[PDB]
Each structure stands twice: as C-alpha cells, then as structure tokens.
Amino acid sequence: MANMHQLLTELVNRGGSDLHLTTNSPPQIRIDGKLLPLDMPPLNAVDTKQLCYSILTEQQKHKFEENNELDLSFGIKGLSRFRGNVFVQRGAVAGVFRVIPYKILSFEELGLPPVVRELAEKPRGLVLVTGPTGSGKSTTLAAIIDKINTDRHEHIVTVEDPIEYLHPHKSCVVNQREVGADTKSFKNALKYILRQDPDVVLVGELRDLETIEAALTLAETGHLCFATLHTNSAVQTINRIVDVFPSYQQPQVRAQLSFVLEGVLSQTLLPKASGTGRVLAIEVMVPNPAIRNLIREDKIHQIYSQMQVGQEKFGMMTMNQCLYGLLQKRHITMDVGMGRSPDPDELKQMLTS
Amino acid sequence: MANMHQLLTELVNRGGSDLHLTTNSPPQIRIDGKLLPLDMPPLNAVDTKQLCYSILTEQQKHKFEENNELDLSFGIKGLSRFRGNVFVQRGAVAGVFRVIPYKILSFEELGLPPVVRELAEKPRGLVLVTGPTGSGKSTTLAAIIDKINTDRHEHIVTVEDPIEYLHPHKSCVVNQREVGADTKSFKNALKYILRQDPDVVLVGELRDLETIEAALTLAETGHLCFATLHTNSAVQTINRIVDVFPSYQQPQVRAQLSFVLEGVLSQTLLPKASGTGRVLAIEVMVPNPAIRNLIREDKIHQIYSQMQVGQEKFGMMTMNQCLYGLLQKRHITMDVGMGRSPDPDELKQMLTS
Ligand SMILES: Nc1ncnc2c1ncn2[C@@H]1O[C@H](COP(=O)(O)OP(=O)(O)O)[C@@H](O)[C@H]1O
Ligand SMILES: Nc1ncnc2c1ncn2[C@@H]1O[C@H](COP(=O)(O)OP(=O)(O)O)[C@@H](O)[C@H]1O
Numbered sequence: 001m002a003n004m005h006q007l008l009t010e011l012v013n014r015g016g017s018d019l020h021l022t023t024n025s026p027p028q029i030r031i032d033g034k035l036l037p038l039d040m041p042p043l044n045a046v047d048t049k050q051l052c053y054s055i056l057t058e059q060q061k062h063k064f065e066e067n068n069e070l071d072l073s074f075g076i077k078g079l080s081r082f083r084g085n086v087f088v089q090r091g092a093v094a095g096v097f098r099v100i101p102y103k104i105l106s107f108e109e110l111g112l113p114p115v116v117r118e119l120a121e122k123p124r125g126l127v128l129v130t131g132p133t134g135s136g137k138s139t140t141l142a143a144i145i146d147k148i149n150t151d152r153h154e155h156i157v158t159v160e161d162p163i164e165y166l167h168p169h170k171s172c173v174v175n176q177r178e179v180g181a182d183t184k185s186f187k188n189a190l191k192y193i194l195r196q197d198p199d200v201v202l203v204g205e206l207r208d209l210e211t212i213e214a215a216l217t218l219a220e221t222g223h224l225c226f227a228t229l230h231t232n233s234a235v236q237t238i239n240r241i242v243d244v245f246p247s248y249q250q251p252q253v254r255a256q257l258s259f260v261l262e263g264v265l266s267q268t269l270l271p272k273a274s275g276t277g278r279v280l281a282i283e284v285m286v287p288n289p290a291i292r293n294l295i296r297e298d299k300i301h302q303i304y305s306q307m308q309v310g311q312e313k314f315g316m317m318t319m320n321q322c323l324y325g326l327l328q329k330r331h332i333t334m335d336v337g338m339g340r341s342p343d344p345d346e347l348k349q350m351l352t353s
Numbered sequence: 354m355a356n357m358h359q360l361l362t363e364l365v366n367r368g369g370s371d372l373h374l375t376t377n378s379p380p381q382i383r384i385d386g387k388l389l390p391l392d393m394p395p396l397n398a399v400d401t402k403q404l405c406y407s408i409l410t411e412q413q414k415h416k417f418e419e420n421n422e423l424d425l426s427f428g429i430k431g432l433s434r435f436r437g438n439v440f441v442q443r444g445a446v447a448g449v450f451r452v453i454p455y456k457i458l459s460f461e462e463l464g465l466p467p468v469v470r471e472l473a474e475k476p477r478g479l480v481l482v483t484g485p486t487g488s489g490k491s492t493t494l495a496a497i498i499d500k501i502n503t504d505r506h507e508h509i510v511t512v513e514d515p516i517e518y519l520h521p522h523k524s525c526v527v528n529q530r531e532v533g534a535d536t537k538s539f540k541n542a543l544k545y546i547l548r549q550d551p552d553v554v555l556v557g558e559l560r561d562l563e564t565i566e567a568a569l570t571l572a573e574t575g576h577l578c579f580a581t582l583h584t585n586s587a588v589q590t591i592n593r594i595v596d597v598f599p600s601y602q603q604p605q606v607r608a609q610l611s612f613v614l615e616g617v618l619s620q621t622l623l624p625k626a627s628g629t630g631r632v633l634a635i636e637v638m639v640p641n642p643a644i645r646n647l648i649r650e651d652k653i654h655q656i657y658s659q660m661q662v663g664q665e666k667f668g669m670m671t672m673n674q675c676l677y678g679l680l681q682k683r684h685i686t687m688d689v690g691m692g693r694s695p696d697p698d699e700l701k702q703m704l705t706s
Contacts, residue, residue, distance in 0.1 A: 018550040020508065025522045030550065034506040035526055068536055069545050085548045088535045089528040090516070096550045132570050133547035271575075301601065339612030340573070342605050344649055 001054035005076060008097065010038065012080055021048050022094040045092035052086045052095040059180055073100060073162040083164065100164060104146045110139060111280040115315030116265065119286075120147040125262030126219035128206075130229040130237050136267045136280055137228050138164050144226065145202065149174055154199035159189045161204060172200075190214040194221070202226045209244060216253070219260035233319060233342060234264040234285030235304050238295065251298075258295035261287050266319065270326075270336050279331050281340065283319035286310070320347045327351070354400075355380065355393060357407040358429060363391065365433050365452065368630070370487075374401050375447035385624055385631050386487070398445035405439045405448040426453065426515070436515070457499045457518055463492060464633035468668030469618065472639075473500035478615035479572040481559075483582040483590050488620045489633055490581050491517050494555060497579070502527055507552035512542045514557060525553075543567045553577045562597050569606070572613035586672060586695060587617040587638035587660065591653055611648035614640050619672065621693055623685050632684045634693065636660075636672035673700045680704065 007027050011019040016029035026040045043051070053061060055074050064070040068088040075081045081100040086093060107117050119127050127144075129137045142165040145156060149170040156172050161179035168174070175196075176182075183189040186203070187210050193201060198218075205228050206212050218225040231237040241257060242250050264285040269278035285291070285303075288310055294303050310316040323337040324347065341347040360380050364372045369382035369389075376398050379390045396404075406414060408427050417423040421441040428434045436451040460470050472480055480497075482490045495518035502509060502525040509525045514532035521527075528549075529535075536542040539557060543564070546554055551571075558581050559565045571578040584590040591610065598606050617638040622631040638644070638660055647655050663669035676690040677700065687704075694700040 020526050020550070022526060022528055025526055028526055030508075035508060036506065067541075069541060071545070071548060083548075085545060087528075087530070087545060087549065089530050090535065094528055096548075098550070132574060134574065268573075341608065344608050 001050075004051045004054045007038075007051070008076055008082060009079060011097070012099065017098065019097040020095075021051055021097075022089065023048055023092040048095065049093040052084075052093050055084065056086075057181065063180060071162060073164055081166070083162075102166075104142045104165060105139065107143055107147070110136070110143060112140065112143065112282070113284065113315060113317065115263075115284055115286060115317075116140070116144065117147060118315065119263045119265075120144045121151075122224055122262050124219065124222045124224050124260075126215060126225050126227070126257075126260045127263045127265075128227055128229060128237055128261075129265045129267070130231045131267040132230055132232070134269075136269055140265065140267065141165075141202065141226060141228070142167075145174075145200070146170075148172060148200055148224075152199070155197055156200045156202070157193060157196060157198045158202035159183065159186060159193075159204060160202070161186070186211055186214075193218065198223055200224045200226070204228060205230075206241065212241060212244070212253075216256045216260060220256060231266065232268065233266050233283055233304075234307065235300055237264050237266065238300055238303070242300070254295055254298060258287075258292040261292075261295070263287075268340065270332050270340060273331055273333050273336075279326065281319065281322050281326060281332075282317070283322065284315065284317040286314040286316045288314060288316075320350065323347055324350050355404075357404050358432075360391075360404070361429060361435065361450065362432060364450070370452055372450040373448075374404050374450075376401055376443065376445045385629070386622070401448065402446040405437070405446050408435075408437060409439075453517055455519075457495050458492065460496055460500075463489070463496060465493060465496065465618075465635065466637060466668055466670065468637060468639055469493070469497065469616075470500065471668075472616045473497045473504070475577055475615045477572065477575050477577055477613075479568055479578050479580065479610075479613045480616045480618075481580055481582060481590055481614075482618045482620070483584045484620040485583055485585075487622070489622055490620060493618060493620065494579055494581070495520075498527075498553075498555070499523075501525060501553055501577075505552075508550055509553040509555075510546060510549060510551045511555040512536065512539060512546075512557055513555070514539070539564065546571070547574070551576060553579070555579045557581060558583070559594060565594055565597065565606075569609050569613060573609065577615075578613075584619065585621070586619050586636055588653055588656055590617050590619065591648065591656070595653075607648055607651060611640070611645040614645075614648070616640075621672075623679070623689050623693065626683055626686050626689075632679060634672065634675050634679060634685075635670070636675060637668060637670045639663075639667050639669055641667055673703065676700055677703050 011029055016031050018030040020028040021043060023045055024042050026037045026042050028035045028037045060070060060072055064086055070086045073083050082097050083100050084095060084097045086095045129140050131137050145167055149167055149172045153171050156174045158176045163176050163178045177189055179186060201218050201223055203215050203225060215225045215227045229237050229240055231240050242253050245253050266283040268281050270281050272279050285307055291303050291306050307316055307318050319342055323341055326332045327337050338344045360372055364382050369384045371383040373381040377395050379393045379395050381388045381390045413425060417439055423439040426436045434453045436453055439448045482493050484490055498520060502520055502523040506524050509527045511529045516529050516531045530542055532538060554571050554576055556568055568578050568580050582590055582593060584593050595603050595606050619636045621634050623634050625632050644656055644659050660669045660671045673694050676694055679685045680690050691697045
C-alpha cells in the first residue's frame with residue numbers, strides 16, 4: 001500500500017508506459033518499449049499479492065479470486081489515474097499497470113475524418129466503434145462523448161467495465177456507472193436506463209445477446225446508443241451482430257439493424273513510416289437507403305460494393321480506400337499497407353489507376 | 354518388493370520418458386517411444402495401490418478415491434520432477450508417470466538448424482511448430498523462448514496445459530500460465546492477454562477457429578506469437594489454418610498469414626540407427642517474398658517447390674531433404690527414412706544421386 005504508491009509514482013516520474021509486478025523479479029517499468037528493472041529486491045508471492053490487493057476494493061478482491069482475472073481502473077490522489085490488470089501465474093499474483101490520461105484528444109489529433117464529428121451530432125441511432133483491443137476504440141469514443149458533452153444540453157449515461165475516461169459535466173449531464181460497484185451488471189444497469197431519461201448511452205462491448213437487444217432497443221426508441229465490437233470491418237461487424245442469435249430470430253435482428261444503424265467505425269493502429277508512433281487506419285460505413293435494404297434482405301456481402309461508391313455524399317470509406325490515402329501522404333510504407341489490406345489485390349488495382 | 358523411488362530412478366537412469374504401473378504386468382518404461390518391461394515380477398492390486406499412493410498427500414488420496422481419477426505433479430529432491438496420473442481399471446489402481454526435464458537443451462543438441470536460432474530474433478509475427486504428440490514441439494519452443502529471454506528486454510507470456518519447461522527471468526519478464534490453475538482456460542487467458550502488455554505470447558495449439566483469430570490478432574498488433582498444430586508439413590500447416598474458415602473469409606485469412614507468418618517448423622522424432630535414442634527430423638519453411646506471394650495468390654501447392662531451392666539463402670529445408678542428410682550421416686535406416694517421407698520416390702532418387 002505505502003509501497004504501491006511509491007512504485008506507481010516512480011512509473012509516472014520516469015516516463016514509463018507500463019509497470020510490471022511479478023514473482024522472482026523486481027518491479028519492472030517499460031521505457032521506450034523495453035523493460036528495465038527497478039533497483040529493488042525481487043518480489044515474492046506475498047509482495048505481489050499485497051501490492052496488487054492494496055489498490056482493490058473488497059468486491060474486486062472477491063471477483064479476482066473467483067476468476068483469477070480482473071480488469072479495473074483506480075486513482076491515486078494528486079498523481080494520476082491508472083488501468084490495472086491483475087492475473088495469476090505459477091500460483092502467484094502478477095499485475096500490469098498503465099496510465100490513463102486526464103485530457104481527451106480532439107478529432108484532428110486522432111486522425112479521425114470529418115464524418116466522425118457528424119456522427120457525434122446524430123440525434124438518434126446506433127453507432128458502433130470496432131476493432132481489436134487497443135485499436136483506439138476507447139480513445140475515439142471519448143472524443144465523441146466529449147464533443148457531445150461540449151455541444152449539447154442532453155443526458156449522457158455510460159456503463160463501463162471498468163470506467164476508463166472521466167467526463168466532468170460540460171453542457172450535458174454525464175453519469176458514469178462502473179459495473180461491479182455502481183451497478184451489479186450490464187444487464188441490471190440496462191434494465192433501468194430507459195427510466196433515467198437518457199439522450200446518449202454508452203453500453204460498452206456487444207458481449208452477449210442480452211446487451212445487443214438493449215442497445216437496439218435504446219437505438220430504436222429515439223436515443224443515440226454507442227457500443228463496441230472486436231470486428232475489423234463494417235460487413236464483418238454487422239454479421240457478428242446477426243450470427244449470435246438463433247436462426248429463427250436473425251430476421252428480426254436484421255430488420256432492427258437496418259433502421260437504427262447510423263455508423264460503423266472499424267479501426268486499427270499501424271506503424272508510422274518514420275518508425276516512431278502509430279497512425280490510425282479506419283473503415284467508415286455510413287448507411288444509405290441501399291445499404292439498409294441489403295441488411296433487411298440478408299444480403300450483407302453486397303454491402304461492401306455499396307461502400308465503394310458512397311464516398312462523396314456521406315463521408316463513407318472502405319478500409320482499402322483509407323490505406324490508399326495513407327499511402328499517398330507517405331504516412332505508412334507499402335509493405336504495411338499491403339500487409340493489412342483486407343484485399344491486397346484491390347489496393348494494388350487502386351494504385352495503378 | 355520394489356518401491357516408487359527405485360522405479361523412478363531407473364526410469365531416469367535409462368533415459369526413459371514414461372513409467373507404467375498396472376496389474377498383471379511388470380513395471381514398464383517407455384524408451385524412445387516404445388514400452389519395455391522391467392525385470393521384475395508382475396504387479397498385483399496391492400502393489401499398484403501402494404506404489405502410486407506412496408507419492409500422494411492425504412488430500413490427493415481422498416480426491417482420487419472420490420473420482421477414480423487424479424492428475425498431479427510432484428518432485429523427488431535428489432532426482433527430477435514428475436507428472437503423475439492415477440486412475441482405476443479392472444477394479445485396481447493403475448498409474449502413469451511422465452518426466453519433466455529441468456534443463457533446456459541447446460539448438461545444436463536438439464538437432465535444430467541455425468535458421469531456428471534466427472526466429473528468436475523476429476520482432477513480431479506468427480511462428481508455428483507442428484507435429485504429432487511427443488515430436489519435440491515443446492522442447493523446440495522452450496529452446497526458442499530461452500534465447501528470447503536471454504537476449505531481449507521484453508514481456509513473454511506463455512499459456513500451457515500444463516506448464517512443462519520453467520523459464521527463470523533472465524533479461525525478459527516471463528509469466529507462465531497453467532490452464533486449469535493459473536487461468537480457467539485458453540479462451541479466458543486470451544481474453545485478457547492484450548491487456549497484459551505482452552511482447553511474446555505462446556498460445557498453444559490452434560485448437561479452433563477462435564484461437565486462430567486470436568493468434569492472427571496478436572501477430573498483427575506487433576507481437577511475436579508462437580503456436581502449435583498437429584500437421585506434418587508446412588503446406589499442411591498453412592492449409593489447415595486457412596481451410597477452417599468459411600470460403601468467403603479465406604481471402605482475408607490468406608492475406609493475413611502472408612504478412613504475419615515468420616516460420617513453420619514441422620518435426621518428427623525417429624529412432625536412431627544405432628538402437629539408442631531418437632533424432633529430430635524437421636521440415637523448415639521461412640517465408641521469403643516469393644512464398645508470401647504464393648500465399649496471397651492462393652498458390653499453396655507451389656510452396657513446396659520454393660522450399661527445394663531456398664536451401665542455401667534462407668536455411669529452408671523440406672522433410673525429404675532432412676531425411677537425406679540423416680541418411681548420409683547414418684542416423685536413420687532407409688526403412689525409417691522411407692516410412693516418413695511424404696514422397697518415397699523422391700527420396701529414393703535423391704539417394705541414388
Ligand atoms: N486515433 C488514434 N490515433 C493515434 N493513436 C491512438 C488513437 N487512438 C488510440 N490511440 C493510442 O492507442 C493506445 C491505446 O488505445 P485504446 O483507447 O486503449 O484502444 P481500445 O479501447 O480499443 O483498447 C493509446 O496509446 C492511444 O494513444
Ligand atoms: N528436438 C528434440 N530432439 C531430440 N529429442 C527431443 C527433442 N524434443 C523432445 N525430445 C525428447 O522427446 C520427448 C517428448 O517430446 P515433447 O517435448 O513432449 O514434444 P510435444 O510437446 O510435441 O509432445 C522429450 O522427453 C525429449 O527427451
């Protein structure tokens with residue numbers, strides 16, 4: 001506890017990105033991508049458990065002991081907030097701890113096209129921000145919420161496991177519920193959200209069926225609902241939503257999605273051509289009447305063709321079209337663009353044309 | 354009357370892998386893959402129970418009597434560590450006991466070519482070590498991991514069922530997770546691995562479609578991912594990964610594999626011609642620009658032709674080329690070499706030439 005503060009302070013003071021605590025090694029900090037041990041004795045299982053437990057609530061200790069996994073965020077007064085992950089290896093506790101910045105970056109700093117700001121102005125519907133873990137999803141969502149919070153006089157409710165970015169009230173009323181402390185579960189929080197007069201709702205990952213129906217219901221009843229998935233493209237995202245349901249109920253889900261879907265953002269971070277930092281590649285799908293019909297008709301695989309010709313009107317963009325632009329601006333190398341293109345032969349064709 | 358400790362000492366001393374205790378047979382030890390009876394009278398039910406129980410705690414004895422099954426590992430201080438499984442057959446106790454080596458062998462001692470040492474230097478991507486059970490896969494991976502641990506300042510995470518080779522921290526931080534104790538399952542470990550700030554991850558077998566997608570994501574997000582399959586050749590490895598996906602998504606998977614694949618090692622252990630020990634036969638495919646294109650163009654068949662002529666530059670090597678070298682050094686018989694050649698007529702032509 002009194003030592004855990006000192007370890008996390010040293011992480012901040014020395015400009016490290018991640019702090020590692022595990023047995024038979026001293027605490028180690030990642031500086032410029034590479035781990036460096038602190039000048040301390042190696043930790044034992046008593047140390048790692050005491051250090052990691054010193055920053056947990058009783059609910060988190062019981063959840064950690066029930067699953068041997070725990071994602072969480074916590075704050076240290078006067079320093080910073082931190083995202084921690086605690087797990088078990090070779091019968092002992094281990095932990096990794098990252099910093100959570102206080103300041104939300106703008107759409108421009110993040111490399112987000114103007115269509116993303118227009119999604120933050122939608123009065124209602126379902127907007128999905130997808131990609132793998134650490135593909136920029138939380139950062140993009142924080143920028144969108146911060147824009148809504150700055151510009152609108154509405155009620156934002158977020159349900160998070162855990163809460164990552166904090167949104168102090170601006171013009172909106174912003175309520176943020178952390179699963180396992182503020183609310184028992186996503187299911188329990190969503191049962192009452194319509195009785196809380198929301199305008200904008202962040203529901204997190206579309207984990208299971210129960211959460212998908214809540215997001216579709218919120219989006220169907222006139223609210224703007226934000227959610228994430230792990231998928232890598234607009235078409236793959238829509239198929240993920242439909243295919244989790246029983247065969248008899250997939251028609252209804254497809255009908256609901258065609259009306260309420262207002263945007264799908266699929267992101268991935270690629271190495272910059274300079275060799276330092278990462279640059280955002282994003283596929284943007286903004287539904288037009290043609291795409292909404294393809295969803296209703298169970299013709300999802302023909303939507304990609306529609307995305308190729310909807311660029312000028314709605315700000316839509318296939319993943320290959322974004323890589324083309326990153327290549328002409330020399331932000332990424334040809335190998336990285338080809339190595340990540342969902343269809344390298346198409347990207348080749350776009351270059352010679 | 355033989356005790357447990359003398360039996361386990363003989364198993365180690367004779368270079369055996371497994372000790373078998375069951376009624377109406379003498380103790381038998383597996384040497385070079387084949388069972389051999391010890392020069393002792395056959396065991397009865399009193400013997401098998403006394404021998405297996407001699408290495409159990411009181412709690413372990415109780416659990417065995419409740420389920421008639423028990424997996425465990427245990428140590429003999431002056432000898433070695435061991436993995437035991439106790440069960441019941443024909444109303445009597447039976448037992449199998451496996452050896453867990455303490456010492457990782459060098460690349461030369463295992464018969465791995467120098468190009469395998471270079472795989473430990475790869476900054477990112479997917480490396481596959483394939484073959485049937487007990488074909489040396491775990492030992493090869495342990496040799497690679499030890500080099501990374503020695504040479505890099507990065508975070509290595511292994512997920513194992515169970516953990517075999519132990520890796521004390523060297524220059525890396527090494528966390529080793531045993532399925533069923535440290536983590537609930539492979540699926541659960543992989544659910545949190547992206548939040549654990551890893552650089553190198555061992556995920557075990559590409560059991561199902563979901564694990565392949567996890568391995569491609571790790572290799573795509575800047576990590577070095579190691580995994581195994583039960584395929585027997587480089588082409589069989591690439592095909593089995595691609596062919597599990599639906600036909601409409603196989604184009605993306607092939608493009609991904611062409612970018613992230615950094616090596617495929619397909620091994621098999623063959624009995625030596627001398628009659629003692631086993632020798633490694635290995636097919637090595639390291640993708641070069643030509644092979645990566647064959648993957649993108651769906652020309653997997655033609656990869657075999659590239660391996661036949663990529664010997665001098667990149668250290669590539671087909672299985673038949675490896676058997677030829679083992680034959681000239683008289684390490685294997687012609688029948689053993691022929692019994693494993695994927696094309697016996699090709700190996701014959703190489704011998705007469
Ligand atoms: N648009 C972006 N442009 C550049 N870097 C980004 C962008 N979005 C996120 N990042 C960086 O990626 C890292 C983690 O992103 P994160 O928000 O945790 O993604 P996710 O919520 O999907 O896991 C951070 O260091 C962040 O600065
Ligand atoms: N590269 C190797 N060369 C020679 N013998 C090996 C090699 N790898 C393993 N062995 C021997 O074979 C036995 C079993 O192999 P193992 O490592 O368990 O492969 P797998 O994990 O695929 O089942 C080991 O006890 C070891 O003595």
